[PDB]
């Protein structure tokens, strides 16, 4: 079907279809454009007129330009050939390596799995990282919030998660960058190429990138999370595996939604966000779940405006999170890596009914001893180390050993630590921390636990450095 | 007397700092509420003026 | 085309269709769109009709045909719904077949007046020691559960629901309680896991679940509480007892704010419209307790609110505190510390349930409340005694999850605690003593607990035998 | 309902068949004019953001194309425009001249000379609304952009192709940071190394004309105009010109970027471009958002700042650094435009008024300043000394509260306080006195190795000066070695040790 552009106000374009109107959310292609311009329908103003949000610059459009109705919402190429390929919101490749050749196309506006396509039992995603797997296990098919995000290891941690998940469980991953700086986007592309999660030669990539650039109109940065969800939903449903979906950043998702809502002419809600904030977030976050076929585990990087946890954006996102990771500048200083704050990290499934009694008890003991050491550090700073008892110096030693053991060497960081990366299974982690808590290793030096894999590696390190 | 006095001053300052921290937490919560309320109020004024033309 | 019983969608967008026609459509009437959705006709305007779509506006198009159903917005009600999950319009979503109900009730029906009601005189047992002893909830009461993110409110609701099985498995038709659980703006994963948890506890055979999860359009989240309240009013008006748990009533307020702003209504305080108080009072005024001239049925309500950073003096929390008959303040500090349920007994009160409490629990919980109140004010000799006893009681009121207690066990445990038998036991071992003592009394001395339950009081002989049991067990511990 | 073209004049024309003698495809008749916004009837073949020309010699940009009419924003006073005027298409989106013919010339937002030095060469033209580069053309930021300021080059390094952000309050030194950065590039432009020359663009949005005249005099005094363009959009200019001037500057800089050269563009001040856009949007009846700003105000600044790139050798290797300036009101970096541009850029130089009056000028507040590029934009010698300087300053900032007490504390805290005070007195700098990188590294090396732990803090500012003059006069071979080599070789380290000790051996 063919219509005409009747109005162009900023990034909003009003089109007129004399024959037949396209349903809401469809995608319309403007004919007579040097570069593909796609408009997503959002309203039916009546008189055969529709109002559309533009996915690219509307400058140079004329009142009367022909607009062709695709007939289905934005359809992107999904499949195994998207792995290692950057592509923008409307699916066109932007890494200049040729077309994304696939036999499948998926519409980015889908619906959450019905109430019966839902796993009724919780699970645990074993990422092979001690701190994450012990103090804040990642639920399978559950959103994980990731805080910090400045020179603390967010990218290296993301890359390690990609590698471990593609190595342990064999699932692929998607990295949707919502409002991504082009400089940092290119830097991330090259970091992935270097570490090996992307392979330009042999086609053995483990991640499919989807970038919504920071200079695209608000109507594009609002939909790239949906493109990433589509690319991941293919792997969940069609390939029947567990996928990871990194959304960086989610606050930019909410901001783009808010800008689109304002542009369409809607009254802002509490703090100037869209009146549809809760539903705009829910429609996306409800497609990251554990169907009976596969699952999608999402990792949102989260930004808290004004450092306010009650701002509608994080107040609304936190309603969906099933876990939390807190990278801290104060721990990268100590040389511990990954610099995950052991105490500030949280998880919903840290429950004896889900993770089992032994895992829960080990995690609670580690948290308690770390809190005890934190409290004792004040006494050390003020009254001096001499003031301690003998049942407190022991706890200080045990807590320092535990802090050292929570650090790990990553496989995607062998050019930063000189060691060889370790993917510690869960049983190894639980046994190691249980043994350290029991006191079985009180005779070893603290540095024998720094940056090692399972506990046996700590034993070997102690032997190698003492002898 | 001087030993006991210095000990007591250390304890008193620690308690005063703790009380100031609790008060800072409460006032930060109040400040965030007030900041959001002010944003909403100004925005609603703008919206009402725009729609009342 | 019949321009009286049928119209054409003039303009869809925002989830508020404007239709042209339907000249004979009543206000608040339900209409059906061609695609398959349904809508409610708010604004009978001179030239069009403003229909809010109970679904996704993507499916509606300008030109579509709207046909009036001929009846005000209503939902199917009856015994046929027990054990089923249903969306906000009464259409089953668990794929176990058609709902098949004979009666339909309006969701906008008005609450009972002043004469039908009667004071609350029966207890609604929750099997949570803190709730049952310190803030009792009667039948017909409206007891707000107000807290924060992850502080254990859905846990209170589900413990209540699971606990009702002692009565719903018996024969006394005057004690059976049929629970209803309305989930609003809540992850569907959570609803599915909750339904599995109920099915594992054999607690679905008397439970309806209404779902308006976060992926459901705003009108459905707005309308789910009223569908649930009608499903419960059915039992209320038929002489049976019901318990509806709106969860949360703040997500419904957010949905209604969306609906109002998209209709270009004057935002008020925090951008909420002026109807929010009416929105919730219209709903919570239906949890009545009819008098015997009207059946004698009742409908308890346990609305749930999530404060933001512990702010209880916000707008919506204060509205629902001005509507409800009490509070259960779950404190995040206590919850993180280790007290669970984290009820802040200092700020949590029960307007009505105090008179509905059971005598056997009443006498013991009176002294428990006095002792805890005294301890609250001192946190030498008497001070040390009060601290010790208060800590014993506080560690006594900690509870597991999905393990509700019958009233008799609560009476036994609290009696052991308040009469000073644990005043020597180390404060850490109180939970271990409690778990062992419960097993002891539940194994051997069933006669005592049964007599307490039947007589509904701690008689002097029952008091003496309980004294003997607790002292002997404490000796052998 | 109602339309703005339903006025009885248009209907009168159309009823008696008088609408066929008027060409409503390339010409239009002004329906309304007010507050700098004209609403024009016709121009059916006019493109969004195209430039139309009114009968009275004025220009305008057609922003709002509605079914009934076109909303044009006038480039000047609407005194000359009257209802019923005739508006003709120009046919082309707004573009500006570019080339080396602009260097040393003051121009306005549209490339017209305003310094009265004669016509402008202008061999080539460039559209201001051109999409930025993509993921692939760029490569990581590696080269340094020598600011000439000890604090900025030591603790907040700025690479080439980076978007820093000089965010601060009013009268703190932002324009001074910009001008020192512009003036320090003379030592490279004068020389012959063709990959170190930096061409500078200074966009002056919303400043009064006297300020820009004094600034141009300051640059001319320092002989730093022969490689500088200044694009003035002063307060008296119409809102569209203040809105466009950043884009005109960015295109004049994208020219240099596309041709292998390196450019520095200093959008001063962006918070005024935001205000001008807010005016235009509110007068075009567009839906307001927070603080009355339009919805697409993040878009306005992102599509501008994302044109600061570092092209790869397959495209030329040129680059366009951007140094947007934003004026926060009290300290509020959580306001709307400060938030947007802090989330857009790659770092921030955060200036203070507490530090300005405590004597720490430039008032760069480290700890709040950041550069997400970091050491990648530093030379090896600067890396060597600045790692230790930054570590020591970080240690000093967490025990600065005790600075008042100081005594009656352990020896470690005393040493931390002393070293921190010496280092802060070292980072102090004059005005319009940038320093070559060798000078900076020599000074910081002297500071961070303890060779000033004996001098009193009041005397550090005099030491720095005398020592720097000494090394600059007597020891040029060592400075040249450090400069060209780029690192501190062991022999050069020993030479610096002996020089610092010998000069400090007797200072008095
Ligand atoms: N009585 C209890 N004992 C131990 N743990 C509990 C108890 N009640 C709740 N929890 C823990 O608290 C967590 C959250 O519980 P719950 O879902 O009831 O809180 P909520 O307020 O409903 O959460 P949300 O606000 O996210 O819906 C659960 O994972 C559970 O492990
Ligand atoms: N390092 C310095 N040493 C001495 N004086 C300085 C220094 N930096 C700035 N000043 C002085 O401070 C005054 C204000 O500086 P400047 O105008 O550059 O700040 P500004 O923030 O650009 O002001 P505005 O933003 O209001 O235009 C100037 O008169 C300048 O001479
Ligand atoms: N496991 C690790 N081993 C060594 N260095 C690490 C590790 N994790 C993070 N880092 C350090 O953290 C720094 C920041 O890394 P990265 O997260 O990629 O940047 P950003 O935090 O800006 O995304 C790197 O310079 C790296 O040296
Ligand atoms: Mg809950
Ligand atoms: Mg200035």
Coordinates of C-alpha atoms in Angstrom, one line a residue, chain D residues 102-297:
Chain D
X102 CA 38.4 30.7 7.2
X103 CA 41.4 30.5 9.5
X104 CA 42.0 33.7 11.3
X105 CA 38.6 35.0 10.4
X106 CA 35.6 35.8 12.6
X107 CA 32.4 34.5 11.0
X108 CA 28.8 34.3 12.1
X109 CA 26.7 31.2 12.2
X110 CA 26.3 31.2 8.4
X111 CA 29.9 31.8 7.3
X112 CA 29.6 35.5 6.7
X113 CA 32.6 37.5 7.8
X114 CA 31.8 40.0 10.5
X115 CA 35.3 41.3 11.2
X116 CA 35.3 43.6 8.2
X117 CA 38.5 42.1 6.7
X118 CA 36.9 41.5 3.3
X119 CA 35.1 38.7 1.5
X120 CA 35.7 35.1 2.6
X121 CA 37.6 32.8 0.3
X122 CA 35.2 29.8 0.5
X123 CA 36.2 27.4 -2.2
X124 CA 34.0 24.6 -0.8
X125 CA 30.7 24.3 0.9
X126 CA 29.4 21.7 3.4
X127 CA 26.0 20.9 4.8
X128 CA 25.7 21.5 8.6
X129 CA 23.2 18.6 9.0
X130 CA 25.5 15.7 7.9
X131 CA 25.5 12.3 9.7
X132 CA 28.5 11.6 11.8
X133 CA 30.9 8.7 11.0
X134 CA 30.0 5.1 11.9
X135 CA 31.5 2.3 14.0
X136 CA 34.1 1.3 11.4
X137 CA 35.9 4.5 10.3
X138 CA 36.9 5.4 13.8
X139 CA 39.8 3.9 15.7
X140 CA 40.7 4.1 19.4
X141 CA 41.9 7.4 20.8
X142 CA 45.7 7.2 21.2
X143 CA 47.3 10.6 20.4
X144 CA 47.3 13.3 23.1
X145 CA 45.8 16.8 22.7
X146 CA 48.2 18.9 24.7
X147 CA 46.1 21.3 26.7
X148 CA 49.1 23.1 28.2
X149 CA 47.5 23.0 31.6
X150 CA 49.2 20.9 34.3
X151 CA 46.0 19.6 35.9
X152 CA 44.3 18.7 32.6
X153 CA 47.3 17.1 31.0
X154 CA 48.4 15.2 34.2
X155 CA 45.1 14.0 35.8
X156 CA 42.4 14.5 33.1
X157 CA 44.2 13.6 29.9
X158 CA 42.4 14.5 26.6
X159 CA 43.1 12.6 23.5
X160 CA 42.4 13.5 19.9
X161 CA 38.9 12.5 18.7
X162 CA 37.6 12.7 22.3
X163 CA 34.7 14.7 23.6
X164 CA 35.7 16.2 26.9
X165 CA 33.3 18.6 28.8
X166 CA 34.4 21.7 30.7
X167 CA 31.5 21.7 33.1
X168 CA 31.4 24.3 35.9
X169 CA 29.6 27.2 37.5
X170 CA 29.7 30.8 36.4
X171 CA 33.0 32.6 36.5
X172 CA 35.2 29.6 37.3
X173 CA 37.6 29.5 34.3
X174 CA 35.9 27.5 31.6
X175 CA 36.6 29.9 28.8
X176 CA 40.1 30.2 30.3
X177 CA 40.6 26.5 29.9
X178 CA 39.5 26.8 26.3
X179 CA 41.7 29.8 25.4
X180 CA 44.8 28.2 27.1
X181 CA 44.1 25.1 25.0
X182 CA 43.8 27.2 21.9
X183 CA 47.0 29.2 22.6
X184 CA 49.2 26.2 23.6
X185 CA 48.9 24.8 20.0
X186 CA 51.2 27.5 18.6
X187 CA 54.3 25.6 19.5
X188 CA 53.1 22.8 17.3
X189 CA 51.6 24.9 14.5
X190 CA 54.7 27.0 14.2
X191 CA 56.9 23.9 13.9
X192 CA 57.1 21.5 10.9
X193 CA 55.7 18.3 12.3
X194 CA 52.6 18.0 10.2
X195 CA 50.8 15.4 12.4
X196 CA 51.0 17.5 15.5
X197 CA 49.4 20.7 14.1
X198 CA 46.0 21.4 15.6
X199 CA 43.5 23.8 14.0
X200 CA 41.1 25.5 16.5
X201 CA 37.5 26.5 16.2
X202 CA 35.8 28.6 18.8
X203 CA 32.0 28.6 18.7
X204 CA 30.7 31.5 20.8
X205 CA 27.0 30.9 21.3
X206 CA 25.1 33.6 23.2
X207 CA 28.0 35.7 24.4
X208 CA 27.9 39.5 24.1
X209 CA 29.9 41.0 21.3
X210 CA 32.3 42.8 23.7
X211 CA 33.4 39.4 25.1
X212 CA 34.1 38.0 21.7
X213 CA 36.0 41.1 20.7
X214 CA 38.2 40.9 23.8
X215 CA 38.7 37.2 23.1
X216 CA 39.8 37.8 19.5
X217 CA 42.2 40.5 20.8
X218 CA 43.6 38.0 23.3
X219 CA 44.1 35.4 20.6
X220 CA 45.7 38.0 18.2
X221 CA 48.0 39.1 21.0
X222 CA 49.2 35.5 21.4
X223 CA 49.5 35.2 17.6
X224 CA 47.0 32.3 17.8
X225 CA 44.5 33.5 15.1
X226 CA 46.4 32.4 12.0
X227 CA 45.1 28.9 12.8
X228 CA 41.8 29.7 14.6
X229 CA 38.3 30.2 13.4
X230 CA 35.7 32.0 15.6
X231 CA 32.0 31.5 14.9
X232 CA 29.9 34.2 16.7
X233 CA 26.2 33.7 17.5
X234 CA 26.0 36.5 20.1
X235 CA 23.0 37.4 22.2
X236 CA 21.5 39.8 19.7
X237 CA 21.4 37.1 17.1
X238 CA 18.1 35.4 16.3
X239 CA 17.4 32.1 18.0
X240 CA 18.0 30.0 14.8
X241 CA 21.5 31.4 14.4
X242 CA 22.4 30.5 18.0
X243 CA 20.9 27.1 17.4
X244 CA 22.9 26.6 14.1
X245 CA 26.3 28.0 15.1
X246 CA 27.5 24.8 16.8
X247 CA 26.6 22.9 13.6
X248 CA 28.4 25.4 11.4
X249 CA 31.5 25.1 13.6
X250 CA 31.2 21.3 13.6
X251 CA 31.0 21.2 9.8
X252 CA 33.9 23.6 9.4
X253 CA 35.8 21.2 11.6
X254 CA 34.6 18.1 9.9
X255 CA 36.2 19.5 6.8
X256 CA 39.6 19.4 8.5
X257 CA 38.8 16.0 9.9
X258 CA 37.9 14.6 6.5
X259 CA 41.2 15.8 4.9
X260 CA 43.7 14.2 7.3
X261 CA 44.3 17.3 9.4
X262 CA 43.3 17.6 13.1
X263 CA 40.9 20.1 14.6
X264 CA 39.7 21.3 18.0
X265 CA 36.2 22.7 18.3
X266 CA 35.1 24.4 21.5
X267 CA 31.3 24.7 21.7
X268 CA 31.1 27.5 24.2
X269 CA 28.4 27.6 25.5
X270 CA 26.1 24.6 24.8
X271 CA 23.7 25.4 27.5
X272 CA 22.8 28.5 25.4
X273 CA 22.2 26.5 22.2
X274 CA 19.8 24.4 24.3
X275 CA 18.0 27.6 25.4
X276 CA 17.7 28.9 21.8
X277 CA 16.3 25.5 20.6
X278 CA 13.9 25.6 23.5
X279 CA 12.7 29.0 22.4
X280 CA 12.2 27.9 18.8
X281 CA 10.4 24.7 19.9
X282 CA 8.0 26.5 22.3
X283 CA 7.1 29.2 19.7
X284 CA 6.4 26.4 17.2
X285 CA 4.0 25.0 19.7
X286 CA 5.9 21.7 20.1
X287 CA 5.1 19.6 23.1
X288 CA 7.4 20.6 26.0
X289 CA 9.1 18.2 28.4
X290 CA 11.2 18.6 31.5
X291 CA 12.0 22.2 32.3
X292 CA 10.1 23.2 29.1
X293 CA 12.8 21.7 26.9
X294 CA 11.5 19.8 23.8
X295 CA 11.6 16.0 23.7
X296 CA 14.4 15.8 21.2
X297 CA 17.0 17.9 23.0

